[PDB]
């Protein structure tokens, strides 16, 4: 009734009529409407930008909070990570003692980047064979919304609850997806992890905001 | 006659027969034929795309006047800004006296980065919402061309000179955006203004080409 | 019968029933299936994406001999290039002497770059306005496959082996895109010749291998 239908949320709030394009008539999870640039009026192209939506999307809603939890530990839990900053975070595997999780050498203590990238291919790769033609876990029904063995606690059954569960995941993980922008673009810019900045903010928000670093584009000091 | 209908002018001049994509029948302005890649074919996305093209054109018209006219009065009329050159305009708001009009200190006198750009985002918002939606200054009948009140001095009551002004201003907005490209391109390789560019090109044309700082990926001395 | 039709070979293999757009009807040479993205759904951007497509390839074919051709002859062969490596063989024209072919002053031995720029800008505009349109080698009845005065050793005329001649140019032209990508990352990342690349994996491939330069974001050590 607010995000579904004719009288459904729109990107420009009232200023969006005449801002809708005819093809979005608010039938999918997310739709307010935004497609200025015309790149989904094809149903076909509509479809895989969905899917290519929703996968960045639950992507990033991944990798917010595993770039977080590793400097927040460090900073305010007293854990002694090797680099807690999630851009360092790779270059851990390069350092003596190699990658230890949680600070600790008796986990994990991986020591070759071939053997990660290369077992991680083979993983993903199956995975995502899996994710676009069925696997072991089911059948690929849904692109997007398998279900069955991915929704194991059931909290999918009811239609109604369902497409709200849908506005509120593809919700959040545009608000993820745009946190990850932010992350992208700080590291280049300030060089401090997204913790560390946000604990510089709340501390002089008027001499530390983004605007101190402007003069350099994406980091590099051109001018 | 000439650029609009079938026998208008395109884009590779006489190799053009059979360069034009068959939705490109010369019917809006700027016709000359030109989707090789073919990202226009969906009419829809064709609408967009124009939207999109006239946009940032009269954006890059603007800009055009806006990069050169401080640069040109420094360099030719002795006003003293603080940073003629458009690429450091921007820094000027965190040099001590703020940014000075002109370089008047009693013009603007700007001092706050955060209020400019707070109350360019209100002002700049409800401006776009205006354009795609219809506002105080009448109503967005059509997306490019609203006229009525963006129309004071009727130029655009004769259908025919109608559609030769669109072509004049689709081309014109064209060459501005292909300035502006070649403005960007030559502050991240020189470091120059653009008048500072042109100044030195007309003194020593043969020694002062663009191939001087070839070796210089977008101003990175990568090699 | 294994690369064209509905029993062709698809490019997630056993795991692309499902991953393959149904306007993917394994039509054209090097269909794979493989539009995630979507970006082919408009038969006539297909048609415009296959002919980039196709001439990207071309030229990365030509590239990759190109590129590697100099460097190997300098390392393998005694010649001496003014700039063996790729990245680096532009730069030859501002070298003293200037740029000569094989590195024997008495060929080509260009000394203005203006002069060659222009000369290439003519030939390329009128070569490529025949491609387009025709010229006197022919007209340009098909945009990929002119044919005629393109294959004057007849080895497509036969229907069948003119198919199975295009799957082969289509996958050693992707093949060829893909190097010349590898190349660019790895000038950038490296800074050295891929002949001294592959050189260098070949010698140590566990201490030489591409994480050595992970620190990097294309050459720029940000962090
Ligand atoms: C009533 C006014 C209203 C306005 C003006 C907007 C406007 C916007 N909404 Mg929106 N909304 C509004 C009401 C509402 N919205 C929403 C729900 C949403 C959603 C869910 C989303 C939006 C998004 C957007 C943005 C999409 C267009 C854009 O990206 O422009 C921005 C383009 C610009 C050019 C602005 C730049 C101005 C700024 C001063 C730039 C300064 C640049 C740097 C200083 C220098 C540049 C650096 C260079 C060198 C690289 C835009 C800011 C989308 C979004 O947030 O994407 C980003 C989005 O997902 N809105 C609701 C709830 C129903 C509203 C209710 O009233
Ligand atoms: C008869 C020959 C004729 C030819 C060959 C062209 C060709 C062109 N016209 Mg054109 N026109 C011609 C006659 C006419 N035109 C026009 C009206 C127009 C218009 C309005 C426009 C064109 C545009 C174009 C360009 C579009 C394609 C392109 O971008 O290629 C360029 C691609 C290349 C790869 C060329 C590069 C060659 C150069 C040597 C590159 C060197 C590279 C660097 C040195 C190194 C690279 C750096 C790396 C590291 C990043 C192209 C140059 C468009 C344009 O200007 O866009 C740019 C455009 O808007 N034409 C008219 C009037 C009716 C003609 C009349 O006869
Ligand atoms: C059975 C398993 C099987 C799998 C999993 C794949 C998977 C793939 N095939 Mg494929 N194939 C498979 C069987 C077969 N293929 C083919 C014939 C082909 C062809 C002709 C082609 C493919 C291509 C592809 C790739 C296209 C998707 C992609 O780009 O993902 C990759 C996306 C990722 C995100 C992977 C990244 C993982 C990696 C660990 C990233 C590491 C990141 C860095 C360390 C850090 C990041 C740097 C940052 C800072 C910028 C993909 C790897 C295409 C290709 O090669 O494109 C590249 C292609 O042209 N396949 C045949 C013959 C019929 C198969 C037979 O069984
Ligand atoms: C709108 C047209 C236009 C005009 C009039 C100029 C004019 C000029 N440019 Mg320029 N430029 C343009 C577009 C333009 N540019 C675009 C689109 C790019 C991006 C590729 C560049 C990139 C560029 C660089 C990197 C440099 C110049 C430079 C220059 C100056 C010397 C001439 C030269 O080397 O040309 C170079 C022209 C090109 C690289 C492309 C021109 C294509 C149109 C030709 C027809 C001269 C004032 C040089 C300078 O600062 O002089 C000291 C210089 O270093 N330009
Ligand atoms: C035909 C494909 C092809 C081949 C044969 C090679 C071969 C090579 N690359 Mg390479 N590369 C490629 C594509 C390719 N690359 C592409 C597409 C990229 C862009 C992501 C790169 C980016 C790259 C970097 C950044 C580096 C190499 C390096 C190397 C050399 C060491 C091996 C290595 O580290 O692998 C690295 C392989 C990849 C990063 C991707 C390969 C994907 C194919 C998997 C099958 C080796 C000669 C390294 C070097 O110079 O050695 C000293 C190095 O530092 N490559
Ligand atoms: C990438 C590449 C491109 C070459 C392009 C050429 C040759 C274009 C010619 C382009 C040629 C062109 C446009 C010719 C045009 C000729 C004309 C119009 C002739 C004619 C006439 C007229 C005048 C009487 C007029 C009448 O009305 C019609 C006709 C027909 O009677 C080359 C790469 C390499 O050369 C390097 C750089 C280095 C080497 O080591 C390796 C290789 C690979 C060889
Ligand atoms: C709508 C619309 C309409 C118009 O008409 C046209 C239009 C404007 C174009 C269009 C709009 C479209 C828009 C806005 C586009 C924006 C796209 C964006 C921002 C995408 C962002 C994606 C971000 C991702 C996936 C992040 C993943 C992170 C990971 C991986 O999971 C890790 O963190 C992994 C990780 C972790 C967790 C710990 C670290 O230490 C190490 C690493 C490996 C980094
Ligand atoms: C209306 C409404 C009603 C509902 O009821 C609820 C609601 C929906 C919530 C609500 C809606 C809210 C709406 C629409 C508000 C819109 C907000 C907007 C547009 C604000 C945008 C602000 C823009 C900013 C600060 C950019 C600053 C750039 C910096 C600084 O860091 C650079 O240095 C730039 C820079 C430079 C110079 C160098 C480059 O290399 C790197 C970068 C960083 C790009
Ligand atoms: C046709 C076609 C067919 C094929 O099939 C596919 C295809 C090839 C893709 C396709 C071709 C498409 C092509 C060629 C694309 C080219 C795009 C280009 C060059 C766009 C350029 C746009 C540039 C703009 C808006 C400039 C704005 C500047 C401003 C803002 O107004 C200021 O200066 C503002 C300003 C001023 C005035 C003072 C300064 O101090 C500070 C600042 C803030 C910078
Ligand atoms: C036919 C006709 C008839 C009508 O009646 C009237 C008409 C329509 C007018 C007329 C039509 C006219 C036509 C078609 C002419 C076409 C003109 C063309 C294609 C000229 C192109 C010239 C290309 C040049 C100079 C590029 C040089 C690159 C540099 C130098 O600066 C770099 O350093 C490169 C570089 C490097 C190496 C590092 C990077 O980081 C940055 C950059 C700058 C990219
Ligand atoms: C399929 C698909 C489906 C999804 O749904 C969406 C999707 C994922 C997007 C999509 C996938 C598409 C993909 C993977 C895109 C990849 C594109 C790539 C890598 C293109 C690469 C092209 C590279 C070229 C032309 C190289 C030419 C080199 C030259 C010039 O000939 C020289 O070397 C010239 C030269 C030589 C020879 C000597 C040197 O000294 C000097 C120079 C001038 C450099
Ligand atoms: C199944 C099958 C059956 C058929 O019968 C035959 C068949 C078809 C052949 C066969 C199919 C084969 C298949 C599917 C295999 C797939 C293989 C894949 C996905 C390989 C992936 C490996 C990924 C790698 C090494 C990435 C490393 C990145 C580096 C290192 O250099 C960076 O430093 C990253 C980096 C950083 C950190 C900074 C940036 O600035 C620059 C860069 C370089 C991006």
Same mark, same amino acid.
């Given at each position: 009734?607010?995000?579904?239908?004719?009288?459904?949320?729109?990107?420009?709030?009232?200023?969006?009529?005449?801002?809708?394009?005819?093809?979005?008539?608010?039938?999918?999870?997310?739709?307010?409407?935004?497609?200025?640039?015309?790149?989904?009026?094809?149903?076909?192209?509509?479809?895989?930008?969905?899917?290519?939506?929703?996968?960045?999307?639950?992507?990033?809603?991944?990798?917010?909070?595993?770039?977080?939890?590793?400097?927040?530990?460090?900073?305010?839990? %007293?854990?002694?990570? $090797? @680099? +807690?900053?999630?851009?360092?975070?790779?270059?851990?595997? #390069?350092?003596?003692? !190699?990658?230890?999780?949680?600070?600790?050498?008796?986990?994990?203590?991986?020591?070759?980047?071939?053997?990660?990238?290369?077992?991680?291919?083979?993983?993903?790769?199956?995975?995502?064979?899996?994710?676009?033609? %069925?696997?072991?876990? $089911? @059948? +690929?029904?849904?692109?997007?919304?398998?279900?069955?063995? #991915?929704?194991?606690? !059931?909290?999918?059954?009811?239609?109604?609850?369902?497409?709200?569960?849908?506005?509120?995941?593809?919700?959040?993980?545009?608000?993820?997806?745009?946190?990850?922008?932010?992350?992208?673009?700080?590291?280049?810019?300030?060089?401090?992890?997204?913790?560390?900045?946000?604990?510089?903010?709340?501390?002089?928000?008027?001499?530390?905001? !983004?605007?101190?670093?402007?003069?350099?584009?994406?980091?590099?000091?051109?001018?």
């Amino acid at each position: 009734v607010e995000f579904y239908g004719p009288d459904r949320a729109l990107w420009l709030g009232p200023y969006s009529e005449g801002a809708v394009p005819s093809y979005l008539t608010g039938e999918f999870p997310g739709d307010y409407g935004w497609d200025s640039a015309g790149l989904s009026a094809d149903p076909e192209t509509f479809a895989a930008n969905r899917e290519l939506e929703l996968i960045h999307a639950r992507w990033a809603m991944l990798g917010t909070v595993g770039c977080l939890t590793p400097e927040a530990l460090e900073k305010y839990g %007293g854990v002694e990570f $090797g @680099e +807690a900053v999630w851009f360092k975070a790779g270059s851990q595997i #390069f350092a003596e003692g !190699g990658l230890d999780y949680l600070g600790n050498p008796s986990l994990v203590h991986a020591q070759s980047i071939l053997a990660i990238c290369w077992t991680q291919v083979v993983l993903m790769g199956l995975a995502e064979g899996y994710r676009c033609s %069925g696997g072991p876990l $089911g @059948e +690929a029904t849904d692109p997007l919304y398998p279900g069955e063995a #991915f929704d194991p606690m !059931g909290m999918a059954d009811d239609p109604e609850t369902f497409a709200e569960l849908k506005t509120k995941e593809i919700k959040n993980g545009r608000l993820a997806m745009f946190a990850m922008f932010g992350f992208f673009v700080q590291s280049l810019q300030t060089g401090k992890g997204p913790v560390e900045c946000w604990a510089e903010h709340i501390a002089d928000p008027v001499a530390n905001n !983004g605007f101190v670093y402007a003069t350099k584009f994406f980091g590099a000091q051109i001018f």
